[PDB]
Write an enzyme that holds these catalytic residues in place. Structure first.
Site, PDB file in Angstrom:
ATOM      1  N   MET A   1     -21.386  42.900  89.745  1.00  0.00           N
ATOM      2  CA  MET A   1     -21.443  43.470  91.088  1.00  0.00           C
ATOM      3  C   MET A   1     -22.835  43.270  91.671  1.00  0.00           C
ATOM      4  SD  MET A   1     -18.399  44.698  91.646  1.00  0.00           S
ATOM      5  CE  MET A   1     -18.678  45.766  93.063  1.00  0.00           C
TER       6      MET A   1
ATOM      7  N   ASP B   1     -19.560  61.931  85.364  1.00  0.00           N
ATOM      8  CA  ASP B   1     -20.921  61.490  85.629  1.00  0.00           C
ATOM      9  C   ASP B   1     -20.982  60.639  86.903  1.00  0.00           C
ATOM     10  OD1 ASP B   1     -23.632  61.140  85.467  1.00  0.00           O
ATOM     11  OD2 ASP B   1     -23.582  59.638  83.872  1.00  0.00           O
TER      12      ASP B   1
HETATM   13  C1  LIG Z   1     -23.465  52.197  85.867  1.00  0.00           C
HETATM   14  C2  LIG Z   1     -23.747  50.738  85.725  1.00  0.00           C
HETATM   15  C3  LIG Z   1     -25.209  50.412  86.009  1.00  0.00           C
HETATM   16  C4  LIG Z   1     -25.638  50.742  87.438  1.00  0.00           C
HETATM   17  O1  LIG Z   1     -26.879  50.064  87.777  1.00  0.00           O
HETATM   18  N1  LIG Z   1     -25.428  48.973  85.827  1.00  0.00           N
HETATM   19  C5  LIG Z   1     -24.628  48.006  86.333  1.00  0.00           C
HETATM   20  N2  LIG Z   1     -25.003  47.372  87.472  1.00  0.00           N
HETATM   21  C6  LIG Z   1     -24.224  46.407  88.013  1.00  0.00           C
HETATM   22  N3  LIG Z   1     -24.599  45.789  89.146  1.00  0.00           N
HETATM   23  C7  LIG Z   1     -25.649  46.266  90.018  1.00  0.00           C
HETATM   24  C8  LIG Z   1     -26.958  45.575  89.779  1.00  0.00           C
HETATM   25  C9  LIG Z   1     -27.996  46.231  89.153  1.00  0.00           C
HETATM   26  C10 LIG Z   1     -29.197  45.584  88.939  1.00  0.00           C
HETATM   27  C11 LIG Z   1     -29.388  44.257  89.312  1.00  0.00           C
HETATM   28  C12 LIG Z   1     -30.660  43.527  89.044  1.00  0.00           C
HETATM   29  C13 LIG Z   1     -30.862  42.240  89.538  1.00  0.00           C
HETATM   30  C14 LIG Z   1     -32.027  41.549  89.272  1.00  0.00           C
HETATM   31  C15 LIG Z   1     -32.991  42.125  88.485  1.00  0.00           C
HETATM   32  C16 LIG Z   1     -32.814  43.375  87.956  1.00  0.00           C
HETATM   33  C17 LIG Z   1     -31.651  44.067  88.226  1.00  0.00           C
HETATM   34  C18 LIG Z   1     -28.312  43.609  89.904  1.00  0.00           C
HETATM   35  C19 LIG Z   1     -27.113  44.251  90.125  1.00  0.00           C
HETATM   36  C20 LIG Z   1     -23.028  46.059  87.365  1.00  0.00           C
HETATM   37  N4  LIG Z   1     -22.026  45.139  87.638  1.00  0.00           N
HETATM   38  C21 LIG Z   1     -21.185  45.315  86.649  1.00  0.00           C
HETATM   39  N5  LIG Z   1     -21.545  46.298  85.776  1.00  0.00           N
HETATM   40  C22 LIG Z   1     -20.822  46.734  84.572  1.00  0.00           C
HETATM   41  C23 LIG Z   1     -21.644  46.490  83.332  1.00  0.00           C
HETATM   42  C24 LIG Z   1     -20.424  48.195  84.696  1.00  0.00           C
HETATM   43  C25 LIG Z   1     -22.746  46.774  86.221  1.00  0.00           C
HETATM   44  N6  LIG Z   1     -23.493  47.734  85.662  1.00  0.00           N
END
Ligand SMILES: CC[C@H](CO)Nc1nc(NCc2ccc(-c3ccccc3)cc2)c2ncn(C(C)C)c2n1
EC number: 2.7.11.22
Lengths: 826, 327, 248
Positions: free
Chosen positions: B102, B145
């Site tokens: 995402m 949560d």
């Molecule tokens: C509760 C899940 C947590 C919330 O943050 N994580 C999470 N986030 C996503 N995208 C958002 C995003 C975050 C950081 C970046 C990013 C990009 C570049 C450098 C550093 C960070 C990009 C997209 C995800 N899509 C799919 N899932 C699955 C594993 C559930 C994601 N999990």
């Protein structure tokens, strides 16, 4: 944890507001000039201004207004800071002793509210019955000005109109009345309400709403002889009072947006208007008295007076002398003459007050081989664009090199005894189908010149229509001599090509020193550029030669030399290029895990990447493998403005919220997950917008300077012209200076009774954290200015630790020695 | 077949980089080598071996292979590290939970200050979030949560709910004792602050209302560090827990222990007067103190605000990606 | 999407165990012993009936992919119960399962756990999860026995007798490969059908379609009597082989 020290080398120079009144005495005419966090008080003379007092406040000055409530001999000052610290201030002078009294104070922040698009607005009733504040969409806050409201308690009135452009208290009304332009889906409208302190609500206002210009920008409350209000737009100026309605739409003002106004004549007969191309107008109210004896507004006229600096604020002072307060250029005193000069102008400059303006970039270079260091800054904007050469010698010596176009980036090339400077100038679509520049500037007054003939994007087949009168940016690389600061060459980039990044370096086994520019193809249709170039130039024998070009699929936001290779960031990608024996760039390896790689810095094989929203990342080159590796990332979300590497472990960043922070590798090293985590160990609210971090110092560091406790030197430039310095401390020295801050804050009296600890707290709309890891050097350097009784109070029970003595009592003269040493780093 | 999870190797993904610290492991961005699809990989480490495979991950696997909704995150497969496999005992490699990637998370978009939500944008966001919560709640699961960090948004305007690590089944008839400290203090329901160990799906509704208000202010509504301080902040706006508005509040463990400074009146409609009428009614019903009088997810979808929103018009939020670079 | 967890009786002639020289009777015995071990251990620990059954279903599925000669059954059982507890949110510490397993197993039997019982169990979790293809959600005949019985209306006491007798048949079927042959919905009907024959009850009278003699078709579509009868035959075989008799 990390320990760092931050001081000001040059105070903010941009004028953020200016008022005129009778503040120091009921008799003198004062000019109060507001720079970010700084208040300057002047007294108006026949030749110019006599300075009388300057204070700092622990806050960004958002509202500044003078009022004189019944019973006061002289004007009082209202100030509201951007963190919503409100206060009422009084000037008091006892012979030679000048001090500023805090008469009332409090913080007016609401637990729930949406900050408005057009920012904080503060206005005061003509009868000084109340202070109006527009802080949040849909709410109007009233601080009633009763004698007992020493805490500035206030209440909110629900406001149906959510999107308010501007508001003023009107004159000549039976009750306190507000006039505001607002926006809803049907356009913009001007409406009026009466404000009831008794009922704590709005009542229906005196005159009905009227539909106004779609870009209606400013409201003027006209004095009682006429009454009513004037509404300034992009194309038209309209007066509304009761049934009366006038509209003048002179073609001259359509050319440039009008941004400031001021009343010349107290009866309201004449007003000053200023526009962003620097033009100064006179708005005239033509009176017609009826046999009834009543005077009605007959017509409005607009007359062009001349040219000033692009001015944020105007103030008429008196005797035809106007103060031009600039944020984008130098401020001024100018005299308005009744007779025009031979060029047709009624405006003649008197004095010029230096503003380092927006510092878009800067570099430190030792021009005179004096082992000192000089700072060459890209300063100002549009017609105020300039280079400023800054050296120490007790005041800073600043030379100004006018460019009359916007400077963007600067880098020094010693081999060529010159600087490279990226610049952009505004041209307007003209009847030839091409464009015409509004004025000559650096990129058109170069000795020799060239234009890119690149065929890379020439295939096009993408239509971009042009309408007469629209603006465009034209970008150039300027070659500027380091002794004369003459523009030796100017290279114009492709149509719609923006120059974003510039380096001067050698690559590979190539002995030639090149100017390298990274660009982006910017079309209004695109959310994010999808085309761009890396261009290799050689400045030789007075001509700039195009050596090689590399096409990229994005904007080259940042480039830096990396051990003979070229490290460039293209949109999300961070790329490393090699320079072949065929003088072409060849890609070695890429890193893609970014949102937008806006900023790059290097040290050894380590790279620090600044992202639009994902804070800072520590990337590393693995030479054994020929690729990149992620060492650690800051997972706290931040919008970066600039970054810098302090040492192999500590990393400095600047937030778009006027905050600084330092990240460090956890270095526990128990698990890989902790190592990949950059811990935010330093948090500090600077109060300025940092565009550029640059390693260097302007102090004379020729052999013989006593060892300073501070280690390292990072200079930074900001939007308001402020130049600062960040340096590191040992744990022992921090604790000493930190403990001394807490002692100094109990002793030093703040203007507006603003807690210092609150001021420096890390602050976004969503968070507030106490500062950590940062010594406010400006506080420490104030120890030398406090009275002797206060010095000994500060040093009472002060015990140094972790030193030659584990417990060491401190005397005031000892600290006077330490603080005086800390003043020698700038 | 597509269903034989746990055997395919993580070699099949080119790792792009670490995007977050998870609960049971780090989370990576990666690209599938075969299809080019981008994924997020949640790493599960069973090397802790105190309780083996983490229950948090077990919940997310058990539940997300049952839930199929456009507004619920999708687990695509589970893959493993290269195993030497000399002996099953020697093997200590980790497992990766493969999800759809995402573009952004909501906290990031708000914390960076880079998003502006119009009314029409908030409608699309809330309709999807509540529809997904409705799917989960109608399937008798509690998220427990819900925070801005756990609502993922890609630029199409599609919203998906994500961290099901604390999710458990709810039996309406037979009340079950659960863990009382389940939601982050900023998004925690008032009932759990007062110690309700037998809570309802209404806990999630409260969180989403907190987000509803936040999208209209761009600042979290109730920011506190300690459980009592939150109860005060909630009480100042939503009203103090009194038996008049929460008849069974007296039956809660900490009701007498934890009291707000005063008996507060409800000012939600006053302090949120800048919110549209249709939305304000949604907020007042979602941030209702008594969980039994708090609106359901379905009731939010049958509201003047969200009932007539068409998800064909996804109306992505406004993200500046140029001229954000220079002011 | 989702895996297929059901085999034909004829297929059980070709489990790994069979092809390593174990005879059908012995594998059946091993299955009963392992299941009953899981049942007994979890009952001592106070575990919900679903948690016991989930462990048993994991166990039965496991030995469709591995041989009893290479995976000692009581270790597998203990591991299955350990995982089942986490899946069904009735968790237990591995040390407590071992403690109970030691209480119930003699010295020879506990030899399977080797020198470090907890380790032998915890190590297996990886193979178990990969074996059951991370398909952790399992439905059991119990929920359907109750869902369907609730739709019966008539003599409170005759229906409660039907439910309890059928429930016992469910518990007994966990010792068999029926879990591997027929969906739980069919098992629940089969046990209702068996109890009805044994108690001389005519269930259709209690349904909303009292003249629909194939009363189960309104609960489980497409089930021939052939199936229900096969299931009944297999359940009663356990009683005839053992010294135990039908509960009645
Ligand atoms: C509760 C899940 C947590 C919330 O943050 N994580 C999470 N986030 C996503 N995208 C958002 C995003 C975050 C950081 C970046 C990013 C990009 C570049 C450098 C550093 C960070 C990009 C997209 C995800 N899509 C799919 N899932 C699955 C594993 C559930 C994601 N999990």
């Amino acid at each position: 944890m990390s320990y760092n020290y931050v001081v000001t080398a040059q105070k903010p120079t941009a004028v953020n507001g200016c008022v005129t009144g009778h503040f120091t005495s009921a008799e003198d005419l004062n000019l109060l000039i507001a720079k970010n966090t700084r208040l300057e008080i002047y007294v108006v003379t026949a030749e110019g201004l006599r300075p009388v007092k300057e204070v700092g406040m622990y806050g960004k000055i958002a509202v500044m207004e003078l009022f004189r409530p019944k019973g006061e001999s002289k004007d009082l000052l209202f100030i509201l800071t951007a963190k919503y610290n409100a206060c009422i201030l009084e000037y008091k002078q006892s012979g030679e002793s000048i001090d500023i009294i805090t008469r009332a104070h409090g913080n007016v922040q609401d637990r729930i509210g949406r900050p408005s698009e057009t920012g904080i607005i503060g206005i005061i009733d003509p009868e000084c019955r109340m202070i109006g504040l527009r802080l949040y969409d849909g709410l109007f806050k009233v601080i009633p000005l009763d004698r007992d409201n020493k805490e500035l308690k206030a209440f909110n009135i629900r406001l149906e109109e959510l999107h308010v452009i501007d508001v003023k208290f009107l004159y000549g009304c039976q009750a306190p009345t507000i006039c505001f332009v607002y926006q809803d889906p049907q356009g913009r409208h001007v409406k009026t309400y009466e404000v009831s302190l008794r009922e704590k609500e709005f009542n229906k206002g005196p005159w009905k709403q009227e539909n106004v210009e779609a870009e209606a920008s400013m409201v003027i409350a006209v004095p009682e002889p006429f009454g009513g209000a004037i509404i300034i737009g992009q194309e038209s100026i309209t007066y509304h009072n009761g049934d009366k309605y006038l509209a003048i739409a002179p073609p001259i003002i359509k050319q440039s947006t009008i941004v400031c106004h001021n009343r010349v004549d107290p009866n309201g007969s004449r007003y000053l208007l200023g526009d962003m191309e620097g033009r100064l107008f006179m708005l005239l109210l033509e009176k017609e008295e009826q046999m009834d004896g009543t005077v009605t507004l007959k017509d409005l006229r607009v007359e062009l007076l001349g040219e000033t600096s692009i001015a944020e604020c105007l103030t008429y002072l008196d005797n035809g002398v106007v103060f031009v307060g600039s944020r984008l250029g130098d401020s001024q005193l100018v005299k308005l003459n009744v007779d025009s000069n031979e060029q047709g102008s009624y405006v003649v400059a008197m004095e010029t007050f230096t503003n380092l303006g927006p510092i878009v970039d800067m570099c430190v270079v030792d021009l005179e081989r004096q082992g000192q260091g000089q700072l060459v800054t890209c300063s100002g904007a549009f017609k105020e664009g300039s280079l400023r050469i800054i050296r120490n010698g007790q005041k800073l010596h600043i030379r100004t090199v006018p460019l009359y176009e916007s400077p963007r980036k600067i880098c020094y090339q010693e081999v060529s005894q010159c600087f490279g400077v990226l610049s952009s100038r505004i041209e307007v679509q003209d009847t030839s189908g091409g464009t015409t520049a509004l004025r000559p500037s650096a990129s058109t007054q170069a000795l020799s010149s060239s234009v890119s003939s690149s065929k890379l994007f020439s295939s096009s087949t993408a239509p971009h229509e042009t309408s007469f009168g629209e603006e465009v940016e034209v970008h150039n690389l300027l070659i500027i001599d380091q002794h004369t600061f003459e523009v030796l060459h100017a290279h114009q980039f492709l149509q719609n090509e923006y120059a974003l990044s510039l380096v001067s370096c050698k690559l590979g086994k190539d002995p030639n020193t090149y100017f390298i520019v990274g660009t982006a193809m910017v079309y209004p249709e695109e959310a994010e550029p999808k085309q761009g170039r890396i261009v290799v130039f050689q400045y030789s024998d007075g001509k700039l030669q195009t050596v090689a070009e590399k096409e990229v699929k994005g904007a080259v936001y940042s480039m830096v030399e990396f051990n003979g290779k070229l490290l460039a960031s293209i949109n999300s990608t961070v790329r490393l290029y090699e320079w072949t024996t065929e003088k072409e760039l060849r890609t070695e390896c890429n890193h893609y895990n970014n949102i937008m790689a806006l900023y790059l810095k290097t040290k050894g094989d380590f790279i620090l990447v600044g992202d639009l929203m994902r804070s800072v990342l520590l990337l590393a080159y693995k030479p054994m493998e020929g690729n990149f590796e992620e060492i650690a990332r800051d997972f706290n979300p931040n919008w970066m403005s600039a970054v810098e590497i302090l040492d192999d472990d500590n990393f400095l960043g600047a937030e778009n919220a006027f905050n600084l922070f330092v990240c460090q590798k956890d270095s526990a090293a128990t698990t890989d997950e902790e190592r990949q985590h950059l811990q935010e160990v330093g948090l500090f609210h600077l109060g300025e917008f940092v565009n550029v971090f640059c390693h260097g110092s302007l102090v004379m560091q020729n052999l013989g300077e006593t060892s300073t406790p501070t280690q390292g030197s990072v200079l930074f430039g900001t939007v308001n012209g402020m130049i600062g310095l960040v340096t590191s401390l040992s744990e022992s020295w921090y604790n000493l200076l930190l403990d001394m801050q807490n002692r100094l804050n109990k002793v030093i009296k703040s203007v507006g009774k603003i807690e210092h600890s609150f001021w420096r707290s890390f602050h976004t709309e969503r968070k507030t954290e106490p500062a950590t890891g940062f010594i406010d050097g400006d506080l420490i350097e104030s120890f030398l200015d406090i009275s002797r009784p206060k010095m000994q109070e500060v040093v009472a029970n002060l015990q140094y630790d972790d030193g030659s003595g584990m417990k060491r009592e401190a005397t005031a003269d000892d600290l006077i020695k330490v603080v005086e040493e800390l003043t020698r780093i700038h | 077949t597509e269903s034989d999870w746990g055997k395919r190797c993580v070699d099949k993904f080119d790792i792009i980089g670490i995007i977050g610290e998870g609960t049971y492991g780090q989370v990576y961005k990666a690209k599938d080598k075969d299809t080019g699809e981008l994924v997020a990989l949640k790493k599960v480490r069973l090397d802790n071996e105190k309780e083996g495979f983490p229950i948090t991950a077990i919940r997310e696997i058990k539940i997300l292979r049952q839930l199929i909704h456009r507004s619920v995150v999708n687990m695509k497969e589970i893959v493993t590290d290269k195993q030497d496999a000399l002996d099953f005992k020697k093997d200590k490699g980790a497992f990766y939970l493969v999800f759809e990637y995402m573009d952004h998370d909501l906290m990031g978009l708000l914390e960076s200050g880079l998003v502006h939500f119009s009314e029409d944008h908030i409608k699309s966001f809330m309709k999807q979030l509540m529809e997904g919560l409705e799917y989960c709640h109608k399937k008798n699961f509690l998220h427990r949560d819900i925070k801005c960090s756990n609502i993922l948004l890609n630029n199409s305007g599609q919203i998906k709910l994500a961290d099901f690590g604390l999710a458990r089944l709810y039996n309406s008839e037979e009340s079950r004792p659960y863990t009382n400290k389940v939601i982050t203090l900023w998004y925690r329901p008032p009932e759990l602050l007062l110690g309700e160990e037998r809570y309802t799906p209404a806990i999630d509704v409260w969180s989403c209302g907190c987000i509803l208000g936040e999208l209209f202010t761009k600042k979290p509504i109730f920011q506190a560090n300690l459980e009592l301080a939150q109860l005060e902040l909630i009480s100042r706006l939503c009203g103090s827990p009194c038996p008049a508005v929460w008849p069974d509040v007296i039956r809660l463990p900490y009701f007498n222990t934890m009291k707000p400074k005063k008996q507060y009146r409800r000012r939600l409609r006053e302090e949120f007067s800048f919110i549209p009428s249709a939305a304000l009614d949604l907020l007042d019903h979602m941030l209702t103190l008594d969980p039994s009088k708090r609106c359901t997810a379905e009731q939010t979808l049958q509201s003047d605000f969200l009932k007539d929103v068409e998800l064909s018009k996804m109306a992505p939020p406004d993200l500046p990606h140029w001229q954000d670079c220079h002011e | 999407t989702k895996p297929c967890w059901y085999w034909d009786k004829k297929d059980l002639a070709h489990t790994p165990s069979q092809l390593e020289g174990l005879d059908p009777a012995t594998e059946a015995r091993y299955r009963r012993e392992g299941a009953r071990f899981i049942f007994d251990v979890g009952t001592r620990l106070g575990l919900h009936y679903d948690t016991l059954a989930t462990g048993i279903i994991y166990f039965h599925r496991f030995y469709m992919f591995h041989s009893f000669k290479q995976f000692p059954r009581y270790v597998t059982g203990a591991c299955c119960l350990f995982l089942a507890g986490k899946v069904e949110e009735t968790p237990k510490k591995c040390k407590d399962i071992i403690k109970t397993a030691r209480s119930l197993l003699n010295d020879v039997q506990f030899g399977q756990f080797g020198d470090d019982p907890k380790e032998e169990v915890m190590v297996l979790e990886r193979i178990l999860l990969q074996t059951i293809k991370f398909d952790l959600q399992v439905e059991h005949p119990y929920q359907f026995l109750l869902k369907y019985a609730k739709q019966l209306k008539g003599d409170k006491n005759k229906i409660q007798k039907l439910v309890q007798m059928a429930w016992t048949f469910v518990n007994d079927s966990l010792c068999t490969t029926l879990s591997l042959q027929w969906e739980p919905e069919i098992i629940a009907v089969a046990v209702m059908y068996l109890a009805g024959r044994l108690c001389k009850f005519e269930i259709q009278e209690w349904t909303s379609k009292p003249m629909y003699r194939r009363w189960w078709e309104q609960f489980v579509q497409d089930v021939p009597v052939d199936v229900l009868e096969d299931i009944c035959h297999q359940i009663l075989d356990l009683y005839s082989q053992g010294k135990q008799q039908m509960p009645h």
